[PDB]
């Protein structure tokens, strides 16, 4: 994907098409002739290209126009409208750049942003870029929110967001050019090591992996073509579907066994009547035989009745024995047809024992990817964001992912250690109430024209509430938060003296001994240049591991990865840290997931800003005062950092469009 169109792809827009948003902004173009919207499309993704070839500097309207050409540079009022459209919604001139034109001397309007997570930093950074004053309010003593790197000495390991998922169509493909981000590459191959400590053979790996995958598309079949969705008036989760396709497959294996042995017997007793008819054919071969020979011992001469008797009974033996022989060959074609019907037994079991704790390992890292047990994931919608996943391959950030938010926080006033306990909004304005989180008596009152809420969805689910809204949020939002899922997954990072593992493998797994513990330290990660290994606790294990001590968790670590590489082959780590995200009051979880009974629409519902009621009854209805960003907001890029900053960018654009007006709709 290159040319002026490669910008359109990289910017997550169609090329030959026109999105609903630019339709709202450019209704004349979309309702007009085909040619005019074609030229508009060109102008759009062209200026996109110019921004994408050098993200490290702001491109102005005077930077583009002269680099267009007829008959595209002919209409300037339109290229002004498209440039002033794109920077507004953060498709161009976003993130970190050096701006040629120094900022407005006086700001316009006021918004305060709750929380310094990357979505909040994007929103505030571009709102400042737009000529508004912004202030950021953090409960934490540091920025970055759910991107958190551990840095001690040369040891850096991130407990938050680690890998970027593809660079194709990634907004952070440009920030990786804006900030110093050395993107290394994970290596896809994962060896699975059993509970004994020695690796699983390759044939078993392939067998269980393809089986696993095919159970997944089995579930997809259940949803889409069989509409197996509600059960007992309750929505089904892909955990339940996985167990029902597993059960159906085991069931089949059984009933094909029975189908096989039924026909081996039903050809076998069809041998009964035949050789019963053989025994009671033979005994009369004997009786008639001594009849014949006692007839032939009558000695000549004979009257023709006796000669008749001997020759007739002679034929009666010489047509009887042939109906012994032909069905010794009819028999003879039956009884040797039972040992090949024996020699093709159907598979003894659908699935055996030890392999279930391997396929359980695959299920486990599935529960890791979604940060929740498969019991909770909506079967229909859990993969809904898979269509929008990027191209290229997943890249780790070795110097730590905290380099990007601290890079954004440059130039903004972040007020750290101030926890917002109340958000108060009406038609005249907003005032939020904060508390210094060190000395909790000290209270702060901020007033502004709008507030943008980056609060993680876990803290919004908190009951009794950590942040009170006056007036309370409307039911349609609060219930959307209630039915949305929030997952948990945690990392144990271990710091040794040197590498006792294979430097070639970046990640290696360990299969648990039961379905219940399948998420317990199932895979380990060597992605870092220091002697750093970090194992992931996920699934339902992550929730249980938080309330038990750290030294027993690292104890279970070293226990596991001793039997992997040998007992003396491991040191004991200099220092270790474990994450507990669900216990974090500023997280209350890890990232979101669509729960059973939820859907993608809920994300949409959580993006919708909230307008107050009219102050004086009978007044013109007020302006939306309260806005929402964060990973739980962007629908088709949820639970990612790129999705977060995309939300922050778009609602920086929406805040601006409301309080600065939109001059690009002419």
């Amino acid at each position: 994907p290159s040319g002026v169109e490669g910008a359109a792809f990289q910017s997550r827009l169609p090329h030959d098409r026109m999105t609903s948003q630019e339709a709202a902004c450019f209704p004349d173009i979309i309702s007009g002739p085909q040619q005019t919207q074609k030229v508009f499309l060109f102008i759009r993704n062209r200026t996109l290209q110019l921004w994408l070839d050098n993200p490290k500097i702001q491109l102005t309207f005077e930077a583009t126009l002269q680099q267009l050409e007829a008959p595209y540079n002919s209409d300037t009022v339109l290229v002004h409208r498209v440039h002033s459209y794109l920077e507004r919604h953060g498709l161009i001139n976003f993130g970190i750049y050096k701006r040629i034109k120094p900022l407005p001397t006086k700001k316009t309007g006021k918004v305060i942003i709750i929380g310094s997570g990357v979505s909040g930093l994007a929103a505030a950074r571009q709102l400042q870029s737009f000529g508004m004053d912004v202030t950021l309010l953090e409960a934490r003593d540091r920025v970055g929110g759910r991107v958190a790197t551990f840095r001690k000495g040369n040891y850096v390991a991130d407990l938050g967001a680690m890998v970027v998922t593809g660079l194709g169509g990634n907004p952070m493909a440009v920030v990786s050019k804006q900030v110093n981000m050395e993107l290394a590459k994970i290596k896809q191959k994962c060896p699975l090591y059993e509970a004994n400590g020695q690796a699983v053979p390759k044939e078993k790996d392939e067998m269980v992996e393809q089986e696993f995958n095919r159970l997944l598309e089995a579930t997809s079949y259940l949803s889409h073509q069989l509409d197996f969705n509600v059960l007992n008036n309750k929505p089904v989760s892909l955990g339940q579907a996985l167990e029902v396709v597993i059960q159906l497959q085991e069931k089949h294996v059984k009933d094909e066994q029975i189908e096989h042995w039924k026909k081996i017997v039903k050809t076998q007793e069809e041998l009964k009547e035949l050789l019963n008819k053989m025994v009671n054919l033979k005994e009369k071969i004997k009786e008639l035989h001594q009849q014949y020979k006692e007839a032939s011992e009558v000695k000549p001469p004979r009257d023709i009745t006796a000669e008749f008797l001997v020759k007739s009974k002679h034929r009666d033996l010489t047509a009887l024995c042939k109906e012994y022989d032909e069905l010794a060959e009819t028999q003879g074609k039956l009884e040797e047809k039972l040992q090949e019907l024996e020699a093709n037994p159907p598979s003894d079991v659908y699935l055996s024992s030890r392999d279930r704790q391997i396929l359980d390992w695959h299920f486990a890292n599935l529960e890791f990817a979604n940060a929740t047990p498969l019991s909770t994931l909506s079967l229909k919608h859990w993969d809904q964001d898979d269509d929008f996943e990027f191209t290229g391959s997943h890249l780790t950030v070795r110097n730590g992912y905290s380099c990007v938010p601290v890079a954004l926080a440059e130039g903004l006033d972040i007020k750290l250690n101030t926890a917002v306990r109340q958000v108060r909004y009406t038609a005249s304005g907003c005032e939020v109430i904060a508390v210094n989180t060190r000395s909790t008596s000290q209270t702060f009152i901020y007033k502004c024209d709008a507030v943008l809420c980056t609060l993680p969805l876990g803290v919004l689910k908190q009951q009794p509430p950590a942040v009170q809204f006056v007036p309370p949020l409307p039911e349609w939002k609060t219930s959307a938060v209630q039915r949305m899922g929030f997952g948990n997954l945690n990392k144990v990072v271990l710091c040794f003296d040197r590498v006792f593992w294979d430097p070639s493998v970046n990640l290696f797994g360990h299969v648990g001994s039961t379905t219940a513990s399948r998420g317990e330290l199932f895979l380990f990660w060597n992605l870092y240049k220091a002697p750093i290994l970090l194992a992931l606790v996920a699934g339902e294990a992550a929730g249980i591991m938080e309330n038990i001590s750290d030294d027993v968790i690292v104890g279970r670590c070293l226990a596991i990865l001793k039997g992997i590489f040998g007992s003396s082959a491991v040191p004991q780590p200099k220092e270790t840290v474990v994450s507990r995200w669900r216990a974090d009051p500023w997280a209350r979880g890890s990232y979101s997931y669509v729960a059973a009974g939820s859907s993608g629409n809920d994300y949409d519902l959580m993006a919708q800003p909230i307008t107050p009621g009219p102050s004086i009854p009978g007044a013109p209805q007020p302006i939306p005062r309260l806005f929402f960003a964060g990973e739980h907001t962007i629908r088709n890029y949820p639970a990612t950092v790129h999705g977060a900053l995309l939300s922050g960018l778009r609602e920086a654009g929406r805040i601006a469009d409301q309080f600065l007006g939109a001059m690009y709709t002419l």
Partner: protein, 133 residues
């Protein structure tokens, strides 16, 4: 619109597994019972089989007797019509079961032995007491 591999999923069973909580276990368990059931039926029938398979030891070979080699003869001496009318008295219209007892007459010259020496041998009168019984 089809399962990805040799997995089988279609409506009629999934409702049988979802009928209640234990429908899975109760649906595979009586299948296991019906499996070992017919399996013991097998081993039973095997064991009855080997018994009369033992009863068939030696085949019929002591009761086989050498086959007669002969050439078909055109005419008749007087014995094989006295043989013939007796053979059709016991047998009737089964001719290759007559051609054999005579033995020097192949099949087809037994049937033209049904329309010529007839009212002499009174053959249709001897043919219906093979029909009476």
């Amino acid at each position: 619109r089809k399962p990805p591999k040799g997995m089988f999923l279609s409506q009629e069973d999934v409702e049988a597994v979802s009928a209640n909580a234990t429908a899975a276990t109760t649906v595979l368990r009586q299948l296991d019972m019906e499996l070992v059931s017919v399996k013991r039926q097998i081993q039973n029938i095997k064991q009855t089989n080997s018994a009369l398979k033992e009863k068939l030891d030696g085949g019929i070979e002591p009761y086989r007797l050498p086959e007669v080699i002969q050439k078909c003869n055109a005419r008749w001496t007087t014995e094989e019509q006295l043989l013939a009318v007796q053979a059709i008295r016991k047998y009737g219209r089964d001719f290759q079961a007559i051609s054999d007892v005579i033995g020097n007459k192949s099949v087809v010259q037994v049937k033209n032995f049904f329309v010529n020496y007839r009212r002499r041998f009174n053959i249709d009168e001897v043919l219906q007491e093979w029909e009476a019984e």
